[PDB]
Amino acid sequence: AMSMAVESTGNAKAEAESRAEAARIEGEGSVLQAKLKAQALAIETEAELE
């Protein structure tokens, strides 16, 4: 029982930390997409402003 218990806990922490680390860096990805697509829209309509 405890054998396949640690089996199951690791086996699910597997498909867990997978999507988890993917989430980490897809998130910091959108973080800099934010900082950037900011300066995109921020000055598109700064020239179009004028």
Binding site: M2, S3, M4, V6, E7, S8, G10, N11
Partner: protein, 51 residues
């Protein structure tokens, strides 16, 4: 007939003692199947941990 009864009695008793050896054998056959599966599962713990 009175001698065949003696032969049948002694052969029946020996058959019972043969069944004694067979059944005691099967008995700890079960337990040792059991104890070796014990050790196998003890380390199947490490199997599935690391797997």
């Amino acid at each position: 007939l009175a001698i065949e009864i003696t032969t049948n009695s002694q052969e029946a008793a020996a058959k019972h003692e043969a069944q004694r050896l067979e059944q005691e054998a099967r008995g700890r056959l079960e337990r040792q199947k059991i104890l070796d599966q014990s050790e196998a599962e003890k380390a199947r713990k490490e199997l599935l941990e690391l797997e």
